[model samples]
Target chain A: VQTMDPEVTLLLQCPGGGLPQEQIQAELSPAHDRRPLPGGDEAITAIWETRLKAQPWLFDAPKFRLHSATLAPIGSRGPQLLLRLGLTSYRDFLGTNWSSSAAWLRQQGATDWGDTQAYLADPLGVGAALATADDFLVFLRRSRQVAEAPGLVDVPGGHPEPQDLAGQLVVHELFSSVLQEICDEVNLPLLTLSQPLLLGIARNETSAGRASAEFYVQCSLTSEQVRKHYLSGGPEAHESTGIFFVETQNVQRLLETEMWAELCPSAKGAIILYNRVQGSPTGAALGSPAL
Target chain B: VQTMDPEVTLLLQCPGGGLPQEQIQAELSPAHDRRPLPGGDEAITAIWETRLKAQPWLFDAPKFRLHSATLAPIGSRGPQLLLRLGLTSYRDFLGTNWSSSAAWLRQQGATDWGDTQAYLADPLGVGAALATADDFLVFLRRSRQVAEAPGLVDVPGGHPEPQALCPGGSPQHQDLAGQLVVHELFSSVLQEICDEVNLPLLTLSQPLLLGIARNETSAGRASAEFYVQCSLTSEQVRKHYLSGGPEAHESTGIFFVETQNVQRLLETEMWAELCPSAKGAIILYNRVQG
Candidate 1:
């Protein structure tokens, strides 16, 4: 039982709403989802409230269990970022974007190509990636393309989990594991990787009918350094269209113009890299000389 | 699905005169009691480091959750108070405390005292009024006392279940007829209560140990106010000993102290509440003030 400073407030909010009583009865009675709006806020709220009523201590404020992870580089003056990663769907159960979806995500680095607008608007087709003061980095792999799709560009990356390692799937690992994966895939020595600092967490609703919690961390690598150290690990390791470091300013544009809709929404884990180029004492302008 | 914004930090430091991994492991394991030597920097550092490695998110700096009912009263207040009401000797799981022991508690509060600490700690022996809080305005109650021993005190409280109703233990009519037990007991009400006021969750080791992911809302009171009013019988009824307005300071003291302990130990809801006054919130703190 590790305890945190009581003065610090940790808030945990579940994203999805409850289903209606009628809908809930229908599902529990038959354990099926044929009814419209199968699991709504009323249902979810009903379940949660019941358990809470049973355990009043759970209602006491000020001491809640904190659930999130932060990943930082190994050294000081690194780029700090946070990420909220989870499994959700592109379409909401209601055929519309769930209330949990982050409206700000489209403005971030999410690409809108390959019918991206249509898919995003569909609530079932749109995936999101919202940038915070903390950059959210996601690593994805391409297993099928390695052997079957010869012409496909094999971007060098690794999976966050073992099963996802072979497929084009989003990686959601413990913060430490995430940092380690980045180092391994880029072949960057641990020493070269500055300390990764956890900044905070940003939570929002995903269009995919689920709540998303993102952890924010900062790393100390510059765009040039990041590209320089990037390695292409042959065909097996190289599974995507190659890695590109997109600064914060260029993120929204890339999302609006890119053809990301062609990619499987579930397999989408496009890494969004950001740096406080102007704010940090160590930061440099895009064209400025490196320290 | 309810969530809170809490930040945790992870710090890594080398132990002085590096102890071998096996010895370190042995010293840190639960078998050794994992007790920290008082005022020892090494112990403090060890605890901090161990916690960080074990649960990295705990180190994330704290953030607020919006939907927390427990937090509803905490706005602008520098620190918030909490209370845990329960039955049995569960408080001992955290640390050694004279107040938590059955013998000491019986001596301090019980009218019909028993020789055995274990027997005195039982629900029937101690009764509800035996519970007391020194400061803060809140007190905790155990489900057993609220449901099983309603005649023990004039003001009886139980864990709120959606299906609970008047006359003690009666399921609400709607709940009884529709097989709404699952919906009423397990779903909305449980999470709403558990995540009430956005209380933080404790570290859970075994994944299976985590409560069921899904639940059904049982028919408890519709709201906290309703529950309080019902317990008070519309202000017409009162506890035998607490007929007048409850002391605000003492009630607040009780709530603040127990909440502090829960925050410090990261104890969860299922844990026992040894302190008799653990759940005693002023049944009518605001009403008395009004």
Candidate 2:
């Protein structure tokens, strides 16, 4: 009987906001190092095979499996983050985080490893808060043709490529990858954005806290310019059928209204994190003081 | 209806968190170029004179006046920032941003210049989010004797100096004051932590400029917040702090909390204890580093 949509849930909030790229560290492990699912790899293989058969265009690609996060706080200097990442893949994600048997898999993982996400491919995805120069926030109405969250709302984002032995390369990618998502999904140039601030991470509640790093990026172009670019289409534009805009000021109002029902878990999660940071009172007056 | 103290109201957020210091530009204007107060210099002089009389320790040190910010977006490489700075002084800030007639001055500014803040000395200040290696965030409770935000929690910070960059000469020294201004921006935070927290300069890591924060309680006073990692752990930092550095008397107490508890701390009643500088640093840290 809860009125709130339970699709997305917050894991943590950084009120101080983001740390610079150098403060974040990513440690990657090989593909074979991923924790084994209960009852061997057969069940996962079957799910992935089924997905590939149904969608022949699907190809297995490596992704950063988010195993755990460690924070070394240096007091107000901001927290230095160390992310333990292992190589997962699109194949395992479809078999695990996306599988119909996800609940059972999580239960089994808990029983076997004492951690619900341990045996799953918890790929770290990224999302963007694409605010336009005209003060509108951009969102997309997903195409029903897409596999996940079809016909729901989403922001510009996607997974970071393991390929891209990409400095401080991991942390740099963590920030830059969101910009790439906007470029590809919104059909805009990467240069059109301000550098992305990593707003923190959010999880898909239904996906068992499948985590995504949400970012805030300002677009130099207006919403109309973005709409035209999106209409013209980009490399990955077919994933969504339409572009949407909400006044930046009205985002909270939109979420409170019935329109909230249309957003997917990722969109909801990203927007919520965005609201907390933007709503918290630091985003406005750094301009030259009236003094 | 709001329980929040509203000490720190955010002004603007960086899209990409913060641009590297190199991408930021500072253009300096002499003190003479500052806008004339609506009622002329008479009122401002009276306010400054009163302050000097009450607090003889106060000196007319030169401070940077933040005039305007310009952004030239260049895709994802990072948007370059140009900060328009003019020279003001402690004298001007006390008479303007903190003046008792601040509201009227703003009204006058609005009426005369069509910009309410134009005629005020918008001095730029700096703050630090000093994190210890032992996974704890540091905070200092301000001494009630301080001019602003007394008895409130503050991050270690103070204003960047005009004279520090110039030393003996004017800001026009080879047009290189811009670089020195940026240098002071990064260096001053370390100097603050060293003086306030008593940490050694060598123990601190290279500073990362987190972006700027505006303190609404002080009429939108601007402060650049930076994230600085210390080589010492909280225990060691606490030990050093107790020894009392030069600015030690500015703070009454030092506290430590796990960084993981930042969000919890921000929401709890303790948030009300934090000044805008601390709030700004925490907000930026959570948004960018989270």
Candidate 3:
């Protein structure tokens, strides 16, 4: 029978068998127990303990840990600059968890952040030319732009899936998967990558019927280095269409306006890295100007 | 201690005293018998027999037998309507031991019908209108409106709390009590009114909250004349509200566009009566039109 009370549902599932008629009758009777629980009301505490003991695997998920970092340099004093970043053309599954990270960042007292945007722009095509800046990094598929353009989707690229793969569940390993994907997709060599600053989980519900939990991480990079690694058409040159970076304020405006709905949630979370830098002195170190 | 299951809450109050620990533990365990009671289940049949033997009052409640009548015609329908009127708002409270009248209704698929929306609006105001609808009806106020505008908060008014007048225990009283409050606030008089009309609950969350439940009964009005009524005034009227009938397609569109956001949970068991004959039909009835 469909009862309205959540408590009734629980009763129906009592352990051994159906409740005795006398008990049911008593419960149905008027003078039921109205007293509070004993033990000074430790019910909530007990429930928390029980849940922790019962669900260990939840604690080990990749989304549960920090993964990347970014350095922001401060300029003139104004309310600390707030930066919001977004990703273009990444897997869609990582959006929700990434959004949750944005909420987590706000909870940490990091103000002036806004929603992440998603873009469907290709990284090797217009995405490369559009994103070039000293503070940016682009992942290309091959040493030649033509080769990179053709194999873009097939290349191991963008963020790693948050689900577990093996025993080594370090936060950095997860970042490593993302960086590795970028390298294979953009045909770049491994470099000193920043440690992941995992924000938190973001839950995103999309119109396409795809739900995603994404991780947000922040890191620093330089313009010339990005170009050297990605622009040259030689064998050593990264096969990328282009990469450029815009001022932090512009990115923040984009996020506020929801300009990147097409991008994956992970890419949106990654924007948190840019936002963090724009808002703090730590951000200035990453070459983002204060707003 | 607080437990997740409602049955646990129910079972803990065994009148014969708590069950033995082994029995309690077995009942509370997940590995125990989990299948729901089946049709023709011996336990259910026995409960019905026992209730009939003990409480003759069961006959007075709608559960004992079904009562059917035809309401007056509004226009060309010519009395094609058949109303399976229930004896009490708490018809289901009798459970398997439903009154013979209720059993008769059950045989004909009769359903409980009341105007709960009356309770959701201004109870004093609606009660006044209901009393005026029939001179023989006496609606004694059991409570006054609370501080919150158009919301039900218990206020002392009538002789005893309306709840005290209920026959069963407080839990049953509370369930019916809550329904009573919702009914008054919304100014409708049925619980699960859709069952009689084959309609779904309204999709909107922002229902008109009438503040009190009024105990209403006809002191002298004929049984056949107790038709549902609607009361409206400038205070309760919204100028831009569109006039619509109970039809599925239109109601669905209205629900998705207007009510979906405001009404968090629809009162599946309640009923409402709309005014001006053109403003709207019952939510579920509109849904049925589609």
Top model by lDDT, which number?
A: 2
- What are the chain B TM-scores of all models? 0.18, 0.88, 0.19
After TM-score superposition, the amount by which residue B163's alpha carbon in candidate 1 deviates from its true location, in angstroms, is 44
True contacts kept of 2: 0.00
A best-first ranking of the candidates according to their TM-score comes to 2, 1, 3
Model 2: per-residue lDDT, tens digit, B1-290? 11133656554445465556777777776642358876777877898766543333355777787777777866646437777787777778888889877777778778877866777787888887788998788999975434667689888888887777667745552444777787888888889898778889999988777767777667767787787889899999999988734233446789887888885667777787888778888887766656
> After TM-score superposition, what is the CA distance of residue A159 in candidate 2 from its true location, in Å?
1.3
Per-residue lDDT of model 3, residues A1-291, tens digit only: 222211111101211111111111100111211111222224423443454576543232122211111111122111111111122222111222222232332233222222122111111100111122234433233224331124221112344433310212222234355455444544344443332222222222222111121222223445455455455445444433444444544665545553344333333433433343222111211232111
TM-score of the A chain in candidate 1?
0.33
Off by over 4 Å in 2: A1-4, A30-33, A74-79, A164-167, A234-238, A279-291, B1-290
Question: Please, what is the whole-model Cα lDDT of each candidate in the order they appear?
Answer: 0.24, 0.72, 0.24
TM-score result, candidate 3: 0.22
User: What is each candidate's DockQ, to 2 decimals?
Assistant: 0.02, 0.02, 0.01
User: Ten residues in a row with the worst lDDT in model 3 chain B?
Assistant: B217-226
1 or 2: which has the higher lDDT? 2
